[PDB]
Design a binder for this molecule. Structure first.
Ligand SMILES: [Mg+2]
Ligand SMILES: [Mg+2]
Ligand SMILES: [Mg+2]
Ligand SMILES: [Mg+2]
Ligand SMILES: [Zn+2]
Length: 229
RNA sequence: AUUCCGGUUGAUCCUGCCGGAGGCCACUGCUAUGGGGGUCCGACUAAGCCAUGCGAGUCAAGGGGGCGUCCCUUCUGGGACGCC
């Protein structure tokens, strides 16, 4: 944590904002990550996340989900292009997913990491399993669903210490968001990695669309964003 | 662990089947130091055919006999005892 404080301080001083939200962050009128959500702002400068969530630059908080090469046909042969699917998170409450293209692998990786920061979202965590009622944010608070392409994903709460009972892509994405235990069910073509990742991402996002009462927050130990001990 | 991964195109998304990865049972290649426990070993084809030995006896306190050893007298005998 000590490295990232000074890293954010270094980034803040030499950064020239170009947008309104960047100006708000630069002048110190916005000081917390949670204050840029749920008000319709547009996020176009990656430095905002670097200042407010510096730990997404750690090597352990980034994941290269997949790499593919695609071909365009021309009378002078085949033109090759790289597509990279990547994800980032702070392992507490925030996660982002991105896609980048480039003529060579390094450019595509850089752009994919860059776009993941701009698509960052915050989720809700809790414990809602029938056989584990512990009020601790180690799983999803209730059953959620998502879909993309032909892939349908359903996430079910699990007991503490169970593990992530899901394919590897889902494992990585859920780990980056700070979830330890879950059950799952799927339909469709999971071997299409992009759609699988997007479906898991949408299922995580849909935790904000479920109406809840103040009693439920106490009952399931629902936490929004950072756990904040 | 309420799970996926490879395969149809110059490249993409689907439907759909094949293969991989797990457990148990029967036969089998190569190779093997020790102990304990258990309801394991000619069932699948032939409920096909069988040399040899064994796998159902017991009762002397139900009854007349045979044989043997002893005691009493014994010509003769009567007892007791033990086998058949
Ligand atoms: Mg031409
Ligand atoms: Mg759609
Ligand atoms: Mg075809
Ligand atoms: Mg026979
Ligand atoms: Zn729990």
């Amino acid at each position: 944590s000590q490295e990232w404080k000074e890293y954010a301080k270094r980034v803040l001083d030499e950064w020239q904002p170009k947008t309104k939200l960047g100006m708000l962050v630069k002048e110190g009128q916005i000081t917390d990550i949670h204050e840029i959500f749920r008000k319709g702002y547009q996020i176009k400068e990656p430095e905002i996340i670097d200042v407010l969530l510096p730990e997404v630059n750690a090597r352990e908080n980034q994941e290269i989900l997949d790499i593919a090469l695609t071909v365009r046909m021309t009378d002078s042969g085949r033109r090759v292009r790289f597509r990279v699917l990547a994800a980032v998170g702070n392992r507490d409450g925030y996660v982002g997913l991105g896609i980048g293209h480039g003529r060579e692998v390094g450019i595509a990786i850089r752009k994919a990491i860059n776009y993941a920061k701009l698509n960052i979202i915050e989720i809700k965590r809790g414990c809602g399993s029938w056989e584990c009622r512990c009020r601790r944010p180690h799983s999803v608070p209730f059953t959620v669903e998502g879909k993309e392409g032909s892939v349908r994903v359903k996430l079910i709460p699990g007991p503490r210490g169970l593990g992530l009972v899901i394919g590897d892509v889902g494992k990585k994405i859920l780990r980056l968001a700070g979830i330890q235990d879950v059950w799952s069910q799927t339909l469709g073509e999971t071997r299409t990695t992009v759609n699988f990742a997007k479906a898991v991402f949408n299922a995580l996002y849909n935790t904000n669309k479920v109406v809840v009462t103040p009693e439920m927050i106490e009952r399931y130990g629902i936490v929004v964003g950072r756990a904040m001990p």
